[PDB]
């Protein structure tokens, strides 16, 4: 609604991401259904792990990312599903784009973010079944390479960050499945999935 | 275990000698490429090569008048340590 700098933009996105990451883990069966509880976000059913270590890893991840969004340093936030052999299978990719105050305009972008969630809910329909034994990682693409980025993310202790290898990024013959694009003045975000040729 | 093309260790000192002593504002991409080289020495279980590259870099970068290189080395070392602190439970002793 009201008050604070470019860091409701940041807590909006972070909250959105917490829900997004949780729901991706549910719809792509990365963890058993057992650990999940139905819940309500953006006036839309979502799903949310209450295994507290998983919840912490995701929380710690996004807390580290907050600072980079506050100053709009992030090109994309990628949820990578790896197979049981550590090989990238598919990529949920949030592309985020840069462009006074806020008021009840915010409760307009809360609305636009519901469609993303719904897109994720029913996205088994546009994507091949995933192979079993998958895990997941988080990649952050920054706008340009900058030490200020690596010093802003290395906040949370016991949770350091590294520069990803090519074995962490590369996906061969990747097919593109766009889920949702969105233009407000504050936020311009695309969600698209990069999917391997075969699994 | 590769720094911008260099695999062997006498090659990697060639580069860092060249890069630190010629240039006067190091490109940020370069400083991160070196952090990645370093963090790769940790995964690859080569602490001797890690102490050796850190010891070298400390000589050239701290003997600079240009606080640019003094702070480069402070950024590099800080990143190596958080990663050694979490995979070995210790920090490099730097004499």
């Amino acid at each position: 609604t009201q008050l604070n700098f470019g860091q409701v933009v940041a807590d909006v996105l972070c909250e959105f991401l917490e829900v997004a990451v949780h729901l991706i883990l549910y719809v792509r069966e990365v963890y058993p259904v057992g650990i999940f509880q139905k819940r309500k976000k953006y006036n839309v059913p979502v799903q949310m792990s209450c295994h507290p270590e998983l919840n912490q890893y995701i929380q710690d991840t996004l807390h580290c990312v907050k600072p980079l969004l506050e100053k709009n340093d992030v090109e994309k936030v990628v949820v990578v599903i790896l197979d049981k052999e550590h090989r990238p299978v598919e990529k949920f990719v949030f592309e985020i784009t840069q462009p006074i105050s806020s008021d009840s305009l915010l409760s307009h972008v809360e609305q636009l973010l519901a469609a993303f969630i719904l897109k994720i809910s029913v996205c088994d329909a546009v994507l091949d079944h995933n192979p079993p034994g998958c895990t997941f990682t988080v990649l952050v693409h920054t706008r340009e390479a900058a030490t200020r980025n690596m010093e802003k993310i290395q906040v949370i202790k016991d949770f350091p960050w590294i520069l990803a290898d090519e074995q962490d990024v590369h996906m061969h013959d990747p097919r593109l499945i766009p889920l949702k694009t969105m233009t407000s003045d504050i936020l311009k975000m695309q969600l698209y999935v990069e999917e391997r040729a075969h699994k | 275990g590769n720094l911008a093309g260099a695999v062997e260790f006498n090659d990697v000192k060639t580069l860092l000698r060249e890069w630190i002593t010629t240039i006067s504002d190091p490109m940020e991409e370069d400083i991160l490429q070196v952090v990645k080289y370093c963090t790769d020495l940790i995964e690859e279980k080569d602490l001797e090569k890690l102490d050796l590259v850190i010891k070298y870099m400390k000589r050239l970068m701290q003997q600079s008048v240009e606080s640019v290189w003094n702070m480069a080395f402070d950024f590099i070392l800080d990143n190596v340590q958080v990663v050694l602190q979490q995979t070995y439970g210790s920090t490099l002793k730097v004499t």
């Binding site: 990365v30 963890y31 058993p32 650990i35 295994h51 270590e53 998983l54 890893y57 995701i58 710690d60 991840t61 580290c64 090109e75 034994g133 895990t135 997941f136 990682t137 988080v138 990649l139 952050v140 693409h141 920054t142 706008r143 340009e144 390479a145 980025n149 690596m150 993310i153 949770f159 350091p160 960050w161 590294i162 520069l163 990803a164 090519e166 962490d168 990024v169 | 911008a4 940020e28 991409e29 991160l32 490429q33 990645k36 990663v83 979490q86 995979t87």
Partner: peptide
């Protein structure tokens, strides 16, 4: 030459670690 991509050093807990109460 890809120094704009960052990643947690730590992995999320595995399917195993979870499939064990």
């Amino acid at each position: 030459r890809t120094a704009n991509i960052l990643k947690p050093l730590m992995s999320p807990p595995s399917r195993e670690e979870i499939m064990a109460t």
